[PDB]
C-alpha cells in the first residue's frame, strides 16, 4: 500500500524574505530516508535522513530566498521502494 506522506511547512507556507521556514515531511516508522522534489528543478532537490523515530523528517531553510520558492513534493523510502508523492506544498515568498 505505502501510505503517501504528509508535507507541510512551518511557521507557514508563505514566508517573507530572510526569515526561517521548516518544511516537514511525515512517513511511516519504517522509513529508510526522505527526499524533497521541487518542480522545474532536477530531482532530487534535497534528501534527508529520518529522525528518531523515523516517522518524520526535517528540511530547514534558515533564510528564505527566491530560490526556495515553488512547489515541493516529499517522498519517503520504505524497505521495498519509494512512495507515492505527497500532496504538493507551494512555498510563496513575500
Amino acid at each position, epitope marked *: 500500500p505505502l501510505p503517501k506522506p504528509t508535507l507541510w511547512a512551518e511557521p507557514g507556507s508563505v514566508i517573507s524574505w530572510g526569515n526561517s521556514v521548516t518544511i516537514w515531511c511525515q512517513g511511516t*516508522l519504517e522509513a529508510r530516508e526522505y527526499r524533497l522534489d521541487k518542480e522545474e528543478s532536477p530531482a532530487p532537490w534535497d534528501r534527508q535522513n529520518p529522525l528518531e523515530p523515523k516517522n518524520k523528517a526535517r528540511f530547514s531553510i534558515p533564510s528564505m530566498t527566491e530560490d526556495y520558492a515553488g512547489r515541493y513534493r516529499c517522498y519517503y523510502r520504505s524497505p521495498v521502494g519509494w512512495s507515492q508523492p505527497s500532496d504538493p506544498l507551494e512555498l510563496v515568498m513575500t
Partner: antibody
Amino acid sequence: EVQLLESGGGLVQPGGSLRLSCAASGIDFSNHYYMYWVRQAPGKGLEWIGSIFSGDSASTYYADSAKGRFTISRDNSKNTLYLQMNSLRAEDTAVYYCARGMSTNDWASDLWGQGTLVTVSS
Amino acid sequence: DIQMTQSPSSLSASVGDRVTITCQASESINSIYLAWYQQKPGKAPKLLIYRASTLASGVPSRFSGSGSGTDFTLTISSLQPEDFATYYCQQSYDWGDVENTFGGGTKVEIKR
C-alpha cells in the same frame, strides 16, 4: 534484559511443514524493532529469511527464495514470533535463528537467539 | 535485487597482523544501515559494528569499520588467536526482491 528463546525445531519429513517459535522474554526500551529469521545450512553462509516489524502494521518482508514457502506471523497474546515453513526439502536443513534489530541501532541485530536445528529427513 | 559482496572469502593472517575485510554493494546504500557480524564456529552470530563505523557493546576496541556508498571495510588492528571466525556484512536499507541481506562471508584463519 531482553531474551530471544527459540523452539519448534527437530526432525520433519521431506514435503512436510514446521513452525518455529521465538518467544521474546522480557523487554527493554525498544518500542520499534524488527524480528529476523536467519538460517545457516551445514557449512554454508548465513541466509536471511525475513523480518517482521513490531508496529501495528506488522509489516512482513521475505527473501526472494523464501516467498510462498515461508510465512512469518506474530502472536501478541503470548508475545511469540512464528516462522511457518511449508513444503520442506532436504536442502532446508539448517540452524535457525531469530534476532532483534531496534530502530535506534538502525535495525542492526544486537540480540540473537541460541539457534534451533531443523533436520529434514525421512 | 541488492547483492552484498565480501572479499576475500578466505584469508590467512598471523597474530598481531592488521587485517582488513571489504564489503561491496551492487548499489549505493546509506551507511547507517550497514552492520558487521562475527560468527565463531557453531555459535550464534554477534554484532560487531553498526552504522558502518560504530563499535557495539562488549566488542573489543581492536575492531573498527569505515566506508560510504558502495564500499565498506572492517579492520582488526591487532589480530588475536580467538578472532578465528567468519565475518558477515549486512544491510537494512532495501529488502524485498532481495536474495540475501548478508554477504557471502569472510573466513579468517590464523597463520602460525
